[PDB]
Amino acid sequence: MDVNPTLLFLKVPVQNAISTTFPYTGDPPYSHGTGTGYTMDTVNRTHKYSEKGKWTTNTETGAPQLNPIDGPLPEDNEPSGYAQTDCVLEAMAFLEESHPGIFENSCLETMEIVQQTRVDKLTQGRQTYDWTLNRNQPAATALANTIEVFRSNGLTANESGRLIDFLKDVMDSMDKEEMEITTHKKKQRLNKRSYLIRALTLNTMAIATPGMQIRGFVYFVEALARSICEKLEQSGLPVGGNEKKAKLANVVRKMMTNSQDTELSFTITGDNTKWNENQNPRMFLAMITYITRNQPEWFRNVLSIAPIMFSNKMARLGKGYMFESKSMKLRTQVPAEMLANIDLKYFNKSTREKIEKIRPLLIDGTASLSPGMMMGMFNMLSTVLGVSILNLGQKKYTKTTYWWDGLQSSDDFALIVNAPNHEGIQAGVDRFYRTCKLVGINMSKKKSYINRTGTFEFTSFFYRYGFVANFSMELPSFGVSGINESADMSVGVTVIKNNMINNDLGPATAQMALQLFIKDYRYTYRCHRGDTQIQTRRAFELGKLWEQTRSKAGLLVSDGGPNLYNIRNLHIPEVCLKWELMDEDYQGRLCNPMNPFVSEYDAVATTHSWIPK
Amino acid sequence: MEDFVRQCFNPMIVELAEKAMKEYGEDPKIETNKFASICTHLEVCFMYSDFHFIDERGESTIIKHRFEIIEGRDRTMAWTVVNSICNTTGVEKPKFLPDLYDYKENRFIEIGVTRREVHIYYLEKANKIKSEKTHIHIFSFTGEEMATKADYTLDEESRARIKTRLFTIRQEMASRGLWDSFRQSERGEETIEERFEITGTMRRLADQSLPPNFSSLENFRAYVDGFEPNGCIEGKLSQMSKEVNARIEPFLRTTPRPLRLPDGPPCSQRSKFLLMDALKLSIEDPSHEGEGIPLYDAIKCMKTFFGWKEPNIIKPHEKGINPNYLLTWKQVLAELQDIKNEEKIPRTKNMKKTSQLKWALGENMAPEKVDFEDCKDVNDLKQYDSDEPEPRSLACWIQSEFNKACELTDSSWVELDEIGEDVAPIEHIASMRRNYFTAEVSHCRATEYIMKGVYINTALLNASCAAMDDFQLIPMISKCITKEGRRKTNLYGFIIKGRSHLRNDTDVVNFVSMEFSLTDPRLEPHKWEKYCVLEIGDMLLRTAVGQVSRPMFLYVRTNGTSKIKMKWGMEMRRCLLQSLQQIESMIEAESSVKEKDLTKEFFENKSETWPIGESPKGVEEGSIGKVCRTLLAKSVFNSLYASPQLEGFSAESRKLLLIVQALRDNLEPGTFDLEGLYEAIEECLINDPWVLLNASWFNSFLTHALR
Amino acid sequence: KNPALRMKWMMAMKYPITADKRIMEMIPERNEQRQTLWSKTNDAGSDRVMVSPLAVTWWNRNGPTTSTVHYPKVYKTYFEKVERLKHGTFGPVHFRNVYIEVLHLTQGTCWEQMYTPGGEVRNDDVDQSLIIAARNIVRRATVSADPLASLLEMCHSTQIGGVRMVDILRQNPTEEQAVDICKAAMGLRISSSFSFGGFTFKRTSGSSVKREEEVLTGNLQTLKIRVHEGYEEFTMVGRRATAILRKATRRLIQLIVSGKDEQSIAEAIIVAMVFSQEDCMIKAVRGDLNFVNRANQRLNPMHQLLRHFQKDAKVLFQNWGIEPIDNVMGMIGILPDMTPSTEMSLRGVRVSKMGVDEYSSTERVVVSIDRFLRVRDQRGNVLLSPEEVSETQGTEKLTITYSSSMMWEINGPESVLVNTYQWIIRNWENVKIQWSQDPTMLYNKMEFEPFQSLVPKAARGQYSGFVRVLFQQMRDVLGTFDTVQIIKLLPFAAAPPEQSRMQFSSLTVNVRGSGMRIVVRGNSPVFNYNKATKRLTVLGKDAGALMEDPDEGTAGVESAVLRGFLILGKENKRYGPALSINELSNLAKGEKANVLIGQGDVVLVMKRKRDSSIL
């Protein structure tokens, strides 16, 4: 009598109606999760999980460092960052044994790209921290400023245009005692410690964005990790949709069908939330050194620079804080540079406690965070570690009646464990839990569940009895990209086609997307169909065209003609789709090369393609 | 130069080259010679692996391709194929990615083309790669050809054809007058020794980045290089604490309990506009002079009413400015009359700055700006009130809101353009599904809300970015089509924006919104806490006892919106797409099990019953139409009430739903930490009414399913 | 986000376009309406002037024209895409889950859709057009009230490329399942070979006799079959699969099949197995077989078994058994997993390289036609039937027209509307007489069934009631006939009307998803009538010509526009000012007003004193 959509599941199995539980399917308008207190809590938790790790004082940045590796083994189920180097190396060795040569081929096939990439490759990317201006900036302008400053400071080897040359230039600049920054004329002298702390910065508006001196090394290490993952089957990256869908079915078939009827199989789905706390750059450096065994030393240095630099990473602290006095109706803002020495009476209990915890780390308005990682820079290496842990589960390594396998993608994991009895299943799951704890892999027991094999999910790819329900992508914008008629039409139709091909977009939904596309395009460009009664200035001349043409379907949609696109015919260019139907006189007028208007996407060079003023 | 390559080489080969160079992130425009080199390499590889097949007996036949391309695909596919081939045939794993694989010979072959002499290229390639059981095919434009062991898998005809292709290509470059550049660009890629030394600061940093019990990076490198595992994992596990374990709690039917809802004062409406209680001043068919302009439409809609009274406050804004709302409403009416008195009315009219206008907007209540140095010594100077809002109990008004949002309206709220014809049977199925769903939902209130929000937000954004320092007036207009087929134009109220000097997308613009209504706010006053209620007229409504007079209320409220929120509210059309996606996914899920397109009996059958509600006698079902309307209403509610709380609750409760589902199918499920999941879910039920109603739905489903 | 808003706002101004200066001395300073097509302002940082997109439209519509050369030759990529798409075909879609640009169609969430692109290859225009036309006619006639007479009507009421299809049929030796069925229904001679399982079966040695056998299926279902006893030699002919088969009394001994791909070879092998009438496959039947066509009519058990095997045959392959093979030139085996093997093959089914092909036959026989188009020769074996007709559909090199009453829902909703109005106008005299005398039968005419589909289901009964009441008023008022209105409004009355109070000012017809609107009064884009030339245009496509009938009112009053009201022509300021359609519900019997009907014209209307009733 009163609506209750959840009750739909009372007859429909949940896996079918999973889209019911995705409230947004878009980008919300609030942007909750960025600021300063979040950084405070992140640093505090990172250093808390390493509570018993050894403390030391850095010699270059002059900031404390925490090393939890090889620390005491955890005694409780709470998260532990005590990852043992020997266990990690043994796991990597076992992975190599099961997949001989993998690291060798990865290294030798990546050396070329290490020696081939150009400087401009760094231009592509997300926002970057500009040490020159001390604020997040576009990658291209940051690169221009960096080359300008280095040229001023007499470091012009990067002029060769090779990425490795620029990395050597960065090394030389970092070795220099001090440098000059000229802003427009204001000159700033950054000493060795100042420049070093700036270069190891992690700005926070991939939540964290490193500086520019660390881009190339991160790129190289991620390239090696991707190359290693490619040969790995359990790795969930960098495959697309269809292959990811097939991975789940293949794993289930391998684990279940081969097993005897007597044997019992179970599957656990688990989420590794807050996955960067317990993984340290030092363990990554260890695995990197292991990977490049018996390899040229220059390549080893280039590849190991990244985790070495990250282990001394400095984390910036938001923009600051905002205080308000209701009594006097006043508002003020304080920066993070003054948060080191300031009263704690303004803040509340939790905020003042966090400030108390993080006070002894703020160096020059930038906390020091050696342990733990930051989101979205070394994801592939984490996937490599996960697949190694999984590979350690074969029947030969386990040396037990039970066994297990599964998939890991560094954000979600699924594990199928089978054994002759229920006690066998319990033993298998417990042993996997402990083994993954030893390496520092943390399984959240409050967001994981176990059930008989057949039904589970992984990276939102919900799986039920051989059926996958990929929901890992959001719907893009079906609007006017704002270049020109033909350009916008082509890019948008290609966008919808591509989303149909891979992102698993239903046909009917694609049809409504095309409908809304046509609506928005006509509204924006004021090119409405001649038959429609809508009125505008452009409709006058447009109307004339509708009368002149002998074939309505020949006219381009931008010219007021009908939209003949559909699921079957989406890849064809709009101009080419109406080539024959277009009247000969219209064809000649439209594509006249001598037009005065003209002095990626697939489109024809018609007169409708102009550059906006 | 690239034009010649594009026009001569076939589209497929150039597309493959473009994909390959896009994988490596190299722009073709900057590197011209390498473009031609890669195109030629791919072409020669494909020709080497073209028109060659293996018969069923094993002999070589020319018409199972004899040659399989490995370099014509991406890295992942090539690696998978070569791994499978090696595992099946037990062949030594290649170090690199081979160009081609010969099935008859069951061996990997590499293709090489060079501008200079073939012998140097073969020598360097063999020294670089050839170590054991490897074959390379080397060709050149000079017409000289050679290979390994003088063995050519290709016959004489194919070799001659490839030589002719190379010769005609070379003649083309020579005619174009650019072969000299092509030859000079080749240099053998001199592999001078590469040196990368860590020194100075970096050496210190590296030495300070090792595990415990290590003094320098070199010691660790030596240790790991000589490392070989020996039962370390077993020893650590034996010495690991026994208490650490991921125990499985037997999950039976009796274990789950309903989510504990918060206690406190009831909730309150917080939407940008009224949903159940909106009122419309409508003109059936706008045919007046000067159409399209929102101001004239608003004036005409206003002129249709004559029940204006003297405004007075019935339900005042407790924590706010009550009188100034009345004063600004009076100012709005007087300004509209003044506009009526005009002759050459411009497109829009900006309200003059007045005390009541500023006070209602909040301009005179906005704290000023001053550096922290000059205000540190303030007794009550505190950090912004980042305190968790107080808990609010569940209120029944949100249930009624959703119920009325799911009802069937009597107008065509959404108008969609046309597309091409459908020829494929799958196109027929897609069109059928889309048309059925659209006919179902095009008359639902959710579409009315969508269009109202879109119009309000687009008008507000245009006004904000048009005049920066003017307090413009903006009618809340919505155009629809009745069942009969007359273009109805409804006006719900008015909005006045504040100063709109916007530099950042998150900059907040303050506006004051006045919305008509006919609901007595003394029935459920708690629902109305942010609003000021005036009684600005009386309306005559027809009932079984004639034309009865009832009060006409006005809800005035000061709100603020950000440009990104404005765009979010301007892009609500995607709710229809989401609701479709949902119903289509359910269609596919039910069809796959039966293995047949089931939309025909899903929609037209009218014999299916999907539980969609509850009644005093028990649960209640509906129709696929009710299901579609419910899903669209849910999507629109989620869009309007966008908050992190909603997404958090949905994400944390999806897992509980999945576990209950697994329980239903007798899958013997188990939970490592059920109480932790319960706390994580309940962490999102504090004050929001939408999330509280969702939790109530979840509890109802829990108590029903397990029975 | 930003680019879309930026472009939306930029296009607003008068001269948002930038063009070279030459345009100043090449196009008129303004438009025929005096609108200026350029501005003297020069683009910042350059010498280009600012102009408006109105100049773009002016150049597009009446700009100087040039010869189109180098365009077809330069664009060699997308043109092939167009050719492949248009000349390609389609097929049935299965819900289970050249080819590098059609990924979306072929593969989806959980369904597969076959597609074979085209290019410039294959047969000629006339043969393909005849085959497709016959396929459509047979497929539609499958579901008619009586397929035989219906099919004859469609064949006699259609033409191919401007030439009546009967002449082509009589003067064309092209062979196809649909064409053969149409010829057999027409009573002419058809090929001796019988089209079964999608391939043509031609006997060339041996013979057999028919016996009625009851067989218990593997699913415990008893089926009666006409089993053939006696050695027989058949050839299975198909474009992508040609095979030679021997059969004996309940025994298959040899089958050599050659096909381009493994799928066609497997289909031919399955057809051979089902035709062999082997007991093992009878024991291999699983599930309940109730396969039916679009008409839901039960078919013979053999066709049901063939369809079931075509669905899948994995559980049947291993059941045949294992037998040895010998290595021979041009000999290929058949593994249970459908893969050639040099050392082993599936029982009684081999694969060759060349196979049996090349020479064809020119033999024709006299045949009889049964109730549901099942063509059966004198001997008794089934020759042809729509159940064996392929689902492939493609394109027509030359225009093909279908004037029948059930081919309208093929070219599209616009075609449905145009053809419904063409049928109405062509039968104007008879339809007028029927409407005047016994309109109830007219409102039940099947010829209006397509229109009922376009009109939304939710608003078809109410539309029908409004139309019925309006037409009753038109009949009972007299003296105010208006043919255009009758033709425009007649088709909406097909549904079983119900009482309503709405006064529809426009009715909606769904075309290509978007819903067009046709106004009850005056002209509409869907329905336009030019009295200056006396021509009816439907969506821009001519529908015929109207001749005024021997009834008309040429002096105002029109009683079939407003339900319960009579419009009295031009407005009169003396009467009550313009009213609203909604308000009209309060006027008393005989009252008069100056209602605003629509557009910008006022019409005086009087409320009918009487009341027009309907069934």
Author numbering:
A (entry chain E): 1 to 184, 207 to 227, 240 to 633, 656 to 669
B (entry chain D): 1 to 63, 73 to 716
C (entry chain F): 41 to 137, 227 to 744
Question: How do the authors describe this structure?
Answer:
In the nucleus of the infected cell, influenza polymerase (FluPol) uses the viral genomic RNA (vRNA) as template to perform synthesis of either capped and polyadenylated viral mRNA (transcription), or unmodified anti-genomic copies (complementary or cRNA), which then serve as the template for vRNA synthesis (replication). ANP32 is required for both vRNA to cRNA and cRNA to vRNA replication. ANP32 comprises a folded, N-terminal leucine-rich repeat (LRR) domain followed by a Glu-, Asp-rich intrinsically disordered region known as the low complexity acidic region (LCAR). First, it stabilises the formation of the replication complex, an asymmetric FluPol dimer comprising a replicase, which is part of a parental RNP and synthesises the genome copy and an encapsidase, a newly synthesised apo-FluPol, which binds the 5’ end of the nascent RNA replicate to nucleate formation of a progeny RNP.
To characterise structurally the FluA asymmetric replication complex, without interference from the competing symmetric dimer, we therefore used in the following analysis the monomeric FluPolA/H7N9-4M mutant, bearing the PA/E349K, PA/R490I, PB1/K577G and PB2/G74R mutations. To characterise structurally the FluA asymmetric replication complex we analysed complexes of apo-FluPolA/H7N9-4M with hANP32A by cryo-EM. Consistent with the biochemical and biophysical analysis, a small fraction of particles corresponds to the FluA replication complex, comprising a replicase and an encapsidase bridged by hANP32A. The overall map resolution is limited by the flexibility between the replicase and hANP32A-encapsidase moieties as well as the presence of a preferred orientation. To alleviate this, a smaller number of particles were selected to equilibrate the distribution of orientations, giving a final map of the FluA replication complex at 3.25 Å resolution. The FluA replication complex comprises the asymmetric replicase-encapsidase dimer with bound hANP32A. Both replicase (related domains will be annotated with (R)) and encapsidase (related domains will be annotated with (E)) have the conserved polymerase core, comprising PA C-terminal domain (PA-C), PB1 subunit and PB2 N-terminal domain (PB2-N), but with differently disposed peripheral domains (PA-ENDO and PB2-C). The interface between the replicase and the encapsidase buries a solvent accessible surface of around 3300 Å2, with three main zones of contact. Binding of the hANP32A LRR domain to the FluA replication complex buries ~3300 Å2 of solvent accessible surface of which 80 % is with the encapsidase. The PB2-627(R) domain behaves as a rigid-body part of the encapsidase in focussed cryo-EM refinement, which is explained by its interfaces with PB2-NLS(E) and PA-C(E) domains. The particular juxtaposition of the PB2-627(R) domain with the PB2/627-NLS(E) double domain is a key feature that distinguishes both the FluA and FluB replication complexes from the previously described FluC replication complex.
